[PDB]
């Protein structure tokens, strides 16, 4: 058994962590006090769930997580919340004043003065591991901490844990749930400095999560609880292989192997179904083909884009619930003859399927309804580059006037790092086009 340390940075990461570990506990039968009745090995063991949980002599199962925020208001909720007992105080790290939505402030000014502390707490979790696989880093693009401090942490993690793998769960900036005008700057700054340090990144666009909550859940104005509980479902579908017995995506190295043939193009597109309102009278349960066919509908992608106009570099189908290999392939053939799945000539036109029989777990009183089977499709498509274009364009509108640049220079960042970061995204857009277009 090999362990996975999750790092939650900034408000977005920390709150999304709340949703994930809440769900991780309900799935593995863990109580808020850390007790796990089904676990028969008391205070130890190398089970599949031990990749995310340690065990004390008192039978407590402790997440292998670190919560970091430059301001203490968010993490303080965890300290007095329902799962306050799961974590010990060392795992929760908080500063006193945040980065104020300023990448330079979280990376340089504030980041420098606390970087060595976080690493010290991560080293503690690492020392409890007999074979650490790597790290899962949750953060936002727009936040000053999520962007500025994350990239600094990634650089140092590559220095102290050279051979370890690092995956990201990143929140793409969406105006419908943001009051930050400068998030395009932060997103592009942090993608520039993190690119060479992340092996595989899963981008969730808040615009996508916002619409899925309104169209499928009939939530007129969603809250972070609605958004995050849905985000942790996708996260649970993506990390389930690491926490359960299986043969597909058993370690973090398998995520680059099965999803990233080209290093820089390490941003798979996630697709999930079904999402049914719990307030619904009672839904007609969907089949394997219907939920598989939905994986090619834009309305359930974590990033709004058109895969019909791209090329696939890899594809993983993660199923949870009542699904047998016969049904999966049955629906696939039906989709190959109806959809336009154009792969790249240097990649096999195949896909890997993983089936976990336990159907998705639902948070009591949550928004999602209980379903018998669901799927999450990870497909490395050149179509996701549309999100880069959108973002880069907004970055260009403001940078042409140097608007807000003084806030970054004032924290010690040089202006040239801007254009250097933008030139890198321009290279990223060119790569996607050299692989997708003809």
């Amino acid at each position: 058994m090999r362990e996975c340390i999750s790092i939650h940075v900034g408000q977005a990461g920390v709150q999304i962590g709340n949703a994930c570990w809440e769900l991780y506990c309900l799935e593995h039968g863990i109580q808020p006090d850390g007790q796990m009745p089904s676990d028969k090995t008391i205070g130890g063991g190398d089970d599949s769930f031990n990749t995310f949980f340690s065990e004390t002599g008192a039978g407590k199962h402790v997440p292998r997580a670190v919560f970091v925020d430059l301001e203490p208001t968010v993490i303080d909720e965890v300290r007095t919340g329902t799962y306050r007992q799961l974590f010990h105080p060392e795992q929760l790290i908080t500063g006193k004043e945040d980065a104020a939505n300023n990448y330079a402030r979280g990376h340089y000014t504030i980041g420098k003065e606390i970087i060595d502390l976080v690493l010290d707490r991560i080293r503690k979790l690492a020392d409890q591991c007999t074979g650490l696989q790597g790290f899962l880093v949750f953060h936002s693009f727009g936040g000053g901490t999520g962007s500025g401090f994350t990239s600094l942490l990634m650089e140092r993690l590559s220095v102290d844990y050279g051979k370890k793998s690092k995956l990201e769960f990143s929140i793409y900036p969406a105006p419908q749930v943001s009051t930050a005008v400068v998030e395009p700057y932060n997103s592009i700054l942090t993608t520039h400095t993190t690119l060479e340090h992340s092996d595989c990144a899963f981008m969730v666009d808040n615009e996508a999560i916002y619409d899925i909550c309104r169209r499928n859940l009939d939530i007129e104005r969603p809250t972070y609880t609605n958004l995050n509980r849905l985000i942790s479902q996708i996260v649970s579908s993506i990390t389930a292989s690491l926490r359960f017995d299986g043969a597909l995506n058993v370690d973090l190295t398998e995520f680059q192997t099965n999803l990233v043939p080209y290093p820089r193009i390490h941003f798979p597109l996630a697709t999930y179904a079904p999402v049914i309102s719990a307030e619904k009278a009672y839904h007609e349960q969907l089949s394997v083909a219907e939920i598989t066919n939905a994986c090619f509908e834009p309305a359930n992608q974590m990033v709004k884009c058109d895969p019909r106009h791209g090329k696939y570099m890899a594809c993983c189908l993660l199923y949870r619930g009542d699904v047998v290999p016969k049904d999966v392939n049955a629906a696939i053939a039906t989709i190959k003859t109806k959809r336009s799945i154009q792969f790249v000539d240097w990649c096999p036109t195949g896909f890997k399927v993983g089936i976990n029989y336990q159907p998705p777990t639902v948070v009591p009183g949550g928004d999602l309804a209980k379903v018998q089977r669901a799927v999450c499709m990870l497909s490395n498509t050149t179509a996701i580059a549309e999100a880069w274009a959108r973002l880069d364009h907004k970055f260009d509108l403001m940078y042409a006037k140097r608007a807000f640049v003084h806030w970054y220079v004032g924290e010690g960042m040089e202006e040239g790092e801007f254009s250097e970061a933008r030139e890198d995204m321009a290279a990223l857009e060119k790569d996607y086009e050299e692989v997708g277009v003809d």
Binding site: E97, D98, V181, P184, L397, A403
Partner: protein, 425 residues
């Protein structure tokens, strides 16, 4: 614990600052004796932002009252909530400033500033994590204008990485105490251009027009004008004083509202503005339509004459946040020619459940608009009309100043006008 140190200087400053603490103290359930008697925990949620907690669960405003004459501050001390202020936090002199900037900034003011900074330093030494400062004052007088700007310069020297915020009353010939107000205002504007991060520009002429026309009052008093400033201040500080979905924080506001260091002079406004047909319920469309209308703005500038660099809008009360988003998007998507297209999504909106005392719902408007240049143009013209004849200069040259310094303030602001001009095209 992100504390704000408040400072009010001079007649206008202390009278306006007074009502400000009279308003928000009511919104947080704090009585004249500092005791809390509200009914919602949201009232105390962020209470320590503006209030210090003393023994006996008493809440003492974190304010510093400053003046060069005792008259105005004595009144506040005898005023409605006069008891609530900290006895020590009154720092005053006896000579006064005679509506002279030079006296407040160079002679009289200099003799008193150190003892003020000793009190500021005292409030900061107890702050867990100080966000920054906010200053109420007028620019047309001598103390709040001349000495206020001196305080800001010295506060920045001792706290260079703290946010400096001010509510600055601009002088109009129609609401004028003396003919030297243009002289005093041009000198302060330069200081503010350098040493503040945000400056809510309140024009006394707009306060009059709102009282006269929109509110239907025959040439009111400074007291009537001040209830508008009270409301405005309570509005722009709502997201700071209550648990809003956003993190608030003065620096975050600055980062999102100030694309360029010198263009940080905001146009405030709010709705409703109803005359005494007052019990009528106001719909979310009505709040939005009026909130963007010029007649509800305190700067006395026509926004349809410039362009919005950034806009903030706080809605207060239990309302349809869906209908709120609908209406805001309807104002933008119906007048997008007045917003710069090189700042994506430059209009942000937050809601606050707690409304102004006695109101079901309200809206506050905060606009960083290039139309503010019309204000600095007025002051510049009024200034040059006298300075071209050196009229009334002897009051200032007699306190040690020189004409050269005036000529620089003049040029400094004409450049500030040019700067607002290049960003409108």
């Amino acid at each position: 614990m992100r504390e704000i140190v408040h400072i009010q200087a001079g007649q206008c400053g202390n009278q306006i600052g007074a009502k400000f603490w009279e308003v928000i103290s009511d919104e947080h359930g704090i009585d004249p004796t500092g005791s809390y008697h509200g009914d919602s925990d949201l009232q105390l949620e962020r209470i320590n932002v503006y209030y210090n907690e003393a023994t006996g669960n008493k809440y003492v405003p974190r304010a510093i009252l400053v003046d060069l004459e005792p008259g105005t501050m004595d009144s506040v001390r005898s005023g409605p909530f006069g008891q609530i202020f900290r006895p020590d936090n009154f720092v005053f002199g006896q000579s006064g400033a005679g509506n002279n900037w030079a006296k407040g900034h160079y002679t009289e003011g200099a003799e008193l500033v150190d003892s003020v900074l000793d009190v500021v330093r005292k409030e900061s030494e107890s702050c867990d994590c100080l966000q920054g400062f906010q200053l109420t004052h007028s620019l047309g007088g001598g103390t709040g204008s001349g000495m206020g700007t001196l305080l800001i310069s010295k506060i920045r020297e001792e706290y260079p990485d703290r946010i400096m915020n001010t509510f600055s009353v601009m002088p109009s010939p129609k609401v004028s105490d003396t003919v030297v107000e243009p002289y005093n205002a041009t000198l302060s504007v330069h200081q503010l251009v350098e040493n503040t991060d945000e400056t809510y520009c309140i024009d006394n002429e707009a306060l009059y027009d709102i009282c006269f026309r929109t509110l239907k009052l025959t040439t009111p008093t400074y007291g009537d004008l001040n209830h508008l400033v009270s409301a405005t201040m309570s509005g722009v500080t709502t997201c700071l004083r209550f648990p809003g979905q956003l993190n608030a924080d003065l620096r975050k506001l600055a980062v999102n509202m100030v694309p360029f260091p010198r263009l940080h002079f905001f146009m405030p406004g709010f709705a409703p503005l109803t005359s005494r047909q007052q019990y009528r319920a106001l719909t979310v469309p009505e709040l939005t339509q009026q909130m963007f209308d010029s007649k509800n703005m305190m700067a006395a500038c026509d926004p349809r004459h410039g362009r919005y660099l950034t806009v903030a809008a706080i809605f207060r009360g239990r309302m349809s946040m869906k209908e709120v988003d609908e209406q805001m998007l309807n104002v933008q998507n119906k007048n997008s020619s007045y917003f710069v297209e090189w700042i994506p999504n430059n209009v942000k909106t937050a809601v606050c459940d707690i409304p102004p005392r006695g109101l079901k719902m309200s809206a506050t408007f905060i606009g960083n608009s290039t139309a503010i240049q019309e204000l600095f143009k007025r002051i510049s013209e009024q200034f040059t009309a006298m300075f071209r004849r050196k009229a009334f200069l002897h009051w200032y040259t007699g306190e040690g100043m020189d004409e050269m310094e005036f000529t620089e303030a003049e040029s400094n602001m004409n450049d500030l006008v040019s700067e607002y001009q290049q960003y409108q095209d």
